[PDB]
Design a binder for this molecule. Structure first.
Ligand SMILES: [Mg+2]
Lengths: 179, 4
């Protein structure tokens, strides 16, 4: 079996973009901060800890638009007890057609890899957006790299990436551009 | 860590 079911019909003809969570769209920590966009309770061995989450700038603009252009899929090496609530709060527009977490990654050479082969899509019509090149080692030609984000409220990288994505959204074969 |  594959990780995703068939694309639902309005998505059939779209490129499938796999999008990472931490350091890509948000940055989270257990260290209290005052300006967290979200605070999430996470239970670890019977103790409830608080996770403070900051939104990367332009994340809302970015997701709303990607959600129109692609079949967007959340794929993260983090556990659902963290990632799933954050996606609930982050994803106002329903951009994410599916969510995959740590158990859907492949553990390989000490790293949790996003094995794009396991989605069940044509890789000529798959992209991955992930801040950590280790996450896509099996498919480095499917990637749009993006810098790691932590707290720079000046970051404009998700904004500045939209034009590139618009123009990818049109093509038949993503490799025709990334090679 | 439950994150990354
Ligand atoms: Mg990450």
């Amino acid at each position: 079996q594959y990780l995703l079911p068939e694309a639902k019909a309005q998505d059939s003809d779209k490129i499938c973009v796999v999008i990472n969570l931490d350091e890509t769209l948000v940055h989270s920590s257990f260290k209290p901060v005052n300006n967290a966009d979200f605070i999430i309770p996470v239970e670890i061995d019977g103790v409830v800890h608080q996770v403070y989450v900051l939104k990367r700038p332009h994340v809302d603009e970015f997701l709303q638009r990607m959600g129109e252009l692609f079949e967007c899929v959340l794929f993260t090496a983090s556990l659902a007890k963290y990632a799933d609530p954050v996606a609930d709060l982050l994803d106002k527009w329903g951009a994410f057609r599916a969510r995959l977490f740590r158990e859907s990654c492949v553990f390989h050479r000490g790293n949790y890899v996003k094995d794009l082969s396991r989605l069940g899509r044509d890789l000529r019509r798959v992209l991955i957006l992930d801040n950590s090149p280790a996450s896509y080692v099996f498919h480095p030609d499917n990637a749009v790299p993006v810098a790691s984000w932590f707290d720079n409220m000046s970051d404009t990288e998700l904004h500045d990436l939209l034009p590139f994505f618009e123009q990818l959204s049109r093509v038949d074969d993503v490799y025709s551009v990334l090679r | 860590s439950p994150t990354x």
